[PDB]
Amino acid sequence: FKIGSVLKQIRQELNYHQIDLYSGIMSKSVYIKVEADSRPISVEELSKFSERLGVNFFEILNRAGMNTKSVNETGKEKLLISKIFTNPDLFDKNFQRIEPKRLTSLQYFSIYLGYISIAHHYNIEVPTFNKTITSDLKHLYDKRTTFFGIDCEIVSNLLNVLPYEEVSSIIKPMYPIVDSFGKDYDLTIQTVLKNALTISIMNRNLKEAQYYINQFEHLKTIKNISINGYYDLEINYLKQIYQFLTDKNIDSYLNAVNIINIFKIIGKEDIHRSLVEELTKISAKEKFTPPKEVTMYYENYV
Amino acid sequence: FKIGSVLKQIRQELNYHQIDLYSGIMSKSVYIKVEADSRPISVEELSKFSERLGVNFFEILNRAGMNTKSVNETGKEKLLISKIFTNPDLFDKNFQRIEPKRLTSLQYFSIYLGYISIAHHYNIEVPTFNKTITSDLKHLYDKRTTFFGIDCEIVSNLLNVLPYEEVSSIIKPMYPIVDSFGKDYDLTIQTVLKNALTISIMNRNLKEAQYYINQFEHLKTIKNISINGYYDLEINYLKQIYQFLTDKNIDSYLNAVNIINIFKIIGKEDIHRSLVEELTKISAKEKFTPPKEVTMYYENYVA
Amino acid sequence: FKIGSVLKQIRQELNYHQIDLYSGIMSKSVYIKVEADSRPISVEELSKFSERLGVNFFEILNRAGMNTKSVNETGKEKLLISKIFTNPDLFDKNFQRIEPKRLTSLQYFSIYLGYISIAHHYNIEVPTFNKTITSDLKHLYDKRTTFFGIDCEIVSNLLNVLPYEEVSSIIKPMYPIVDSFGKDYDLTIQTVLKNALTISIMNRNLKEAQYYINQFEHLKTIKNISINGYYDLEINYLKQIYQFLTDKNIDSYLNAVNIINIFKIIGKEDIHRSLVEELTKISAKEKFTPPKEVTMYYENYV
Amino acid sequence: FKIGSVLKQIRQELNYHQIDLYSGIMSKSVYIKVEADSRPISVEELSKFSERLGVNFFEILNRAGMNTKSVNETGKEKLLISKIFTNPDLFDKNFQRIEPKRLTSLQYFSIYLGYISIAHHYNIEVPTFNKTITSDLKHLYDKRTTFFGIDCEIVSNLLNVLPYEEVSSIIKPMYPIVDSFGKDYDLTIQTVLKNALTISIMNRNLKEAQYYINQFEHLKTIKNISINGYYDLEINYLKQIYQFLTDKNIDSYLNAVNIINIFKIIGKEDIHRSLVEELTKISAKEKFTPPKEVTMYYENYV
Lengths: 302, 303, 302, 302
Hints:
72% helix; Helix-turn-helix domain-containing protein (chains A, C, D); receptor (chains A, C, D); mainly alpha; TPR-like_helical_dom_sf (chains A, C, D); Serine Threonine Protein Phosphatase 5, Tetratricopeptide repeat; 0% strand; 302 residues; plasmid (chains A, C, D); homotetramer; 2 domains; 434 Repressor (Amino-terminal Domain)
């Protein structure tokens, strides 16, 4: 909401005068009301002012307090999730308010599935879920033809609380992607590929695996797309295991290990742990012992 | 610009009715004008509507045509750069119009530095530059206390067309960062660090190099920060060369080479070729022959 | 043959006089006959003289022409083999004189097996072989209780021209070794182990494989034993495969590859080539692709 | 000494009759005395018999008790050394007997130098040594023109108890080697090069180091030479350090390290330790930190 004050702050910082901003855009008096936060500001006007100051439209919006995912109701409900995770106590109270609201907006539905995500983790019983989901997804997706970041977010969520086959039908129509709509969007569409790929690999479903690999590679060709490098790495590690599952070939295995280790080296222990675990499982599956190096870390993480 | 039609498109797609959007926000009639793109829309109204649809405010703005860096005059001028790079022909004409406008805004200055960057690359003579920059930078930065993404952008540009010492003064006040203002912002501030660190390492300036490493590792601690993985890697390769230049230590050297290789593996040949080059040079400086692996690639893809 | 002349040569080199050699061993006159090569010399006398000069008994023997594997008839026939290898032309003529003499001495049988090794390699047909071997082996080994270097040598030969099962019975009673009888002896008894272990590994016969590994490790504890380092290395590489085949374990595979490379690094191309090849085959069998590094030499050696 | 019995044992083992051995060599009765160990046996006869049996001349001699380095006085005195090493108590008594006999034969000198080696290790004072060696070495080598294994043995010994400079002049004339005189000889000549190369590398004397490398690589061209693989490896490691000292180059460093590690992998911990230590010292000398892997091994080797 407080865009005007941020405009003032930036203007003064750069030693511009009000006239430098408002002239040919609005009257002096109107502009002062804008800058006082007493008049709301059109996207257009703000975009113009942004040009004049020279600082970036989205940075201004973010300094004006949209960086915080809080200034509206849905935002607050989303922040609520991480609280409820660390303190499952709070679940039932809030979940009872959210379960009915779930189909209000795609955002709400994504929040809902965040609840279910927690419920599965803490063994909490949510009978409603199993009754409703198939019908929910039907309602939400059956006559859909365009999809937005929020749908990919939803799908990552679904992947995390449902069998892959109950999700895959919903995924396939949203890919391939042909435009970036900002780094925020870019990241969302990637997250789905990365999780789906992991699952396909873990299930030894090499056809779906290949698909996800292509879809990701395909993103790289998009204009102004913004690839997550940690993702590029991890997906590359998966591509590496894929070539090993397809051709049990030793360099691919070595490469996979090497990438796992590189996450450790650059301090991304989160990822290191998961990949160490995956690798051990996938090796077990293929009747195979990973390097002592990694079963080392494995047994100590757990 | 066309936010209203995007609202509509998304509305219908989700099978919301107009009332679902506008009620308790504006009159039915006024909404219809918004949706028709005939009435402008306040940030606050749009934010509200975004909540209603369930799709993210920024995504909507970007579908509405802000993802293109072209809907305003400064944007177009920015696009012009890559054109003029690939066909230096066009330089003179445009640069004549831009050199004068360079202090109009930070954006214009950054654009101006892009032209200089090109001129350097194509040996084009730009006498104005050497006369003006010290003065320009003084104008721009002498009485400055808060800095925005665009300043970091400018700083990366400067690093790339001026000696380090001529820029370091300008950099140091902008760090440490203490807040993210979006992934756009977050990338800009990292890019400076990366480019500066690379130069500090390449100059064997280990004090500055450490500073940049620290400023990068600090970013990690910022809330909602969004670290570039490719940078994380590259920086890390630099950290590795750093421990090697301080302690002439073999593991460090091997890790550096390993990282070089990983970029190769993941298809980042741009980066792979730069790092191979660096490593070669740093090695030569320390009277040292890099693995045959790396000098092989160097000769069939750099020499 | 010419030991006396070597004694003179060494004696004068060291500025001893004849008396310094012969005194308390034989008369002046007799010694001069020995030194002229007109009287033969007892092992005991030569040993004593060896002590007085200070140069080593075997060195003197070897300088007197025992280094050359030629000064006797069997020696010559052994040398003959490598000639007949490089020009199979000469086979039939010689092989016709040898095949009948093959049970004259263990030496002769070893030479005969050399011919068969050649015949196998150049596809020459030797029907006599298949008819006689089982009988031959029976004749040679049925009532044997001690074994000599030559037997080991024979066994290596056998391993190289027969299936393992037809040989293993003959091998088993020759191990464990408990005495060294010189470096010549020591080498022979190791060669058998190495070949046998290679075969076992190749056949995935892990029980016999481990037996051979143990027999080799046992040699190491023998007093004055003389272990061949190239063997130690190669056997170690095979131990490393063994652990891999028993436990599909990656460090073992990498070590094995590492050893292969070490042979290349030190210029032992012969060995490098065969190990590259083996590893390739072993990898094939376990549905596995060796590092690209080694599949390069496998193609370009061929 | 007991050759006759060995001949009998072998004869009977192979089911030869006396006549098969003695015919055209000696009378039946004579042969019986030979086989009884009542008549001594000429090298030439023994060689002939060796042919007839089909087992190797040297093996037989070794089975007859020459494998033990004990059946003569000098032999015993050499065995004494390892005893006196593990219990320096015994030193003074024995050394008093040996110090005066040291110039009796090269063998005795070699033994004598083994005493000095011990003395040096246990800080025992041997003033005689420093008085006499220069003159001793002058006495032994001033007028020499050919050299035998024992001289190389002596030179290894001297390298180990004297400064390099005081020994080099003595080494140079003995190389390059042009003939193998058996595996025993072959090893002795290699040992000197190894040790000398080590010292040259450790003193950073790259000219001598290169000389020794060349001398060793020359041996490999010798006909019937028998190269020690462990030495081949270690000298290769040294070559590898040599390239690194000459042109501070990373792949050579890497390779040296690798070799060090191979020794460990094949269980040769004696050598592993020495090479780890050397590498650490050379590294320190060049202002350089070896891999943490190897300084972990230096940390506890103290």
